Design a protein around this ligand. Structure first.
Ligand SMILES: NC(=O)c1ccc[n+]([C@@H]2O[C@H](COP(=O)([O-])OP(=O)(O)OC[C@H]3O[C@@H](n4cnc5c(N)ncnc54)[C@H](O)[C@@H]3O)[C@@H](O)[C@H]2O)c1
Length: 249
């Protein structure tokens, strides 16, 4: 092991390519996209580069090719609750997480890195953001696209949070550290948090949690309004999303 983190996901190239093909077949706005070109831009960002010396500039060709206009008022951010967030947008096709854009979809759940001294993809190990270095191919990609997604948002921006974390709002998460600080005060009217409950019996009003007050305070300073909703039963939440024209929802 050079690095502490998992190596590049097996079949990474085929996977990105196949994801690109699938995405561009499904999403008509991205029909102009040449997936081979996308892949080549993606590779170019990290191949032959030291995996602790990646910059946002490295991903600019990919950002260019992956240019996508998402409805700015229909953005769902999330933190620590990836699965519910995606289940939600799979059904509420009106709304978009980052992983519902081409670039986020290409990269979701994947790891990748290269090596400085060669042009090969490193399937053995990749830098861990913590135990190794922060400017790695994965962390730099996610910070860049997460920032740009946040910059794109307008009107009411929603964020799904895991109410079972004990830092429900975590300043150190990508949401907390990058996206909160890149919501444009000129465009964003309200950030509304949906705090997802995840455990036994009748729960507190988690919108009163100190970390939520922290989030509210941060965003208020940025001249953006804050709203918060408890989602007490995520299972019933999704069921209501799947069939909304139904009493009890
Ligand atoms: N799809 C993703 O894996 C991804 C990663 C980072 C950020 N984001 C965007 O930011 C928000 C969620 O990120 P979050 O950190 O608040 O929630 P989170 O802590 O749950 O992170 C989501 C995933 O990204 C990984 N991750 C988080 N920060 C990372 C970093 N700096 N370097 C490498 N991997 C990292 C985590 O291990 C986890 O698998 C969402 O709005 C999302 O669209 C998505």
């Amino acid at each position: 092991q050079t690095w502490s983190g998992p190596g590049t996901t097996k079949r990474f190239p085929e996977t990105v390519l196949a994801r690109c093909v699938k995405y561009t077949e499904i999403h008509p706005e991205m029909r102009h996209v040449d997936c081979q070109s996308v892949w080549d831009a993606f590779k170019g960002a990290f191949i032959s580069k030291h995996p602790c010396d990646i910059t946002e500039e490295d991903y600019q060709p990919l950002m260019k090719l992956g240019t996508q206009t998402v409805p700015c008022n229909k953005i769902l951010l999330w933190s620590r609750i990836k699965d519910l967030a995606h289940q939600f947008t799979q059904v509420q096709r009106d709304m978009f997480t980052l992983e519902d854009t081409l670039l986020g979809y290409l990269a979701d759940d994947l790891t990748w890195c290269g090596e400085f001294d060669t042009s090969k993809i490193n399937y053995q190990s990749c830098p861990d953001w913590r135990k190794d270095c922060s400017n790695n191919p994965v962390s730099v990609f996610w910070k860049t696209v997460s920032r740009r997604f946040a910059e794109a948002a307008c009107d009411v921006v929603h964020v799904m949070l895991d109410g079972s974390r004990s830092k429900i709002f975590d300043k150190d998460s990508t949401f907390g550290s990058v996206q909160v600080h890149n919501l444009q005060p000129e465009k964003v009217q309200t950030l509304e948090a949906w705090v997802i409950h995840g455990g036994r019996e009748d729960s507190r009003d988690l919108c009163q949690d100190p970390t939520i007050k922290e989030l509210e305070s941060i965003i208020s300073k940025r001249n953006i309004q804050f709203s918060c909703k408890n989602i007490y039963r995520p299972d019933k939440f999704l069921q209501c999303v799947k069939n909304p024209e139904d009493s009890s929802c």
